[model samples]
Target: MNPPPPETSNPNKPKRQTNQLQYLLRVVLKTLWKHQFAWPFQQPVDAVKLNLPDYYKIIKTPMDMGTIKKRLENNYYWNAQECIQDFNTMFTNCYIYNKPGDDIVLMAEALEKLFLQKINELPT
Candidate 1:
């Protein structure tokens, strides 16, 4: 008697799924990069020019959109949640550095709202 066919022919399935996730991440990141409030966060915070000596002390780890983009391109994030966490860190750092009612703080709040909304639309 002949045996039944096994399900082990295609090896590209897992890779294809990961590629889809990466594609979605790029889409979300591009949207954020193009947002009006993305100016301050496009690069690393300049403590010298800003003259905020306590910035480094308050924020243990600094995160920015430019760095995030590089990491994403290099496949530094293993999953979507990791990428999301980096953005959250960036926003949290902003909150800690700026006063509660500051303009940059307000931008961070608004940007974070849009960021989360975009992530929600991603396919899990």
Candidate 2:
């Protein structure tokens, strides 16, 4: 090719891919915030306040719904997949720290299932 092809730009290209994913992630977050057992996972685990001396040592990368909500509001997530990862991390952290079959553990597991169901319904 002697000459480079002319640059083509669609100035009027529809804009929905990013926006739609953010909206869907928001919806999922809201649903999670309203769950009956979402109280414990609402905010980051306060080691000092809750007297959880070993929590920080156990959960290297702690996650929570409150943090996720803030991230979404600040446009920190690129897509729903990223949000899903954080949610899973939150659940896994709880599973690792909380005793199996404990009330909070049960709630986290149930919430994970609900999240999966909702995300699968999205038009990905």
Candidate 3:
């Protein structure tokens, strides 16, 4: 007699059922992260000894005064014209992810890079 097939390999199910398997794997990883196994074994000890201020000088940079002013103006919503103008300006500024003379764009790109690097360094 033939052996029974695994439930996961059931032929009658739709092909998109494979996404359920992928979701299960994501759940397993999320559980591991929640249980504190996502970080390297020495991360807690290393964090205590980290010299963040010693690295501050290497990280400081000039702020974008124009973007700051634009964001501030966008914060106010008194009239429809001001609200629309603020929304358009802020949206345009944020969408310039890598164009020249765009500080907010550069900052966003830097943050995305750092986030990817940190995620890649996490323990399995």
Please give, for residues 1-124, the per-residue lDDT of candidate 3 as tens digits: 1222112222353233233223222342233333322232111112124432322233222122233233233332223333224324333433432255566455444433443444344332
Tens digits of per-residue lDDT for model 1, 41-82? 887887777777777777777888877777666566657676
TM-score, one value per model: 0.79, 0.78, 0.22
Per-candidate Cα lDDT values, in order, are: 0.73, 0.73, 0.31
Clashing pairs in 2: none
lDDT value, residue 67 of candidate 3? 30
**Poorest lDDT segment (10 consecutive residues) of candidate 2:** 1-10
**Which one is best on TM-score?**
1
Better of 2 and 3 by lDDT: 2
List, residue by residue over 12-105, the lDDT tens digit for candidate 2.
4332347546655566888889999888888777777777668877878788888887766656655667767888899999999889889888
TM-score (C-alpha, index-matched) for candidate 1? 0.79
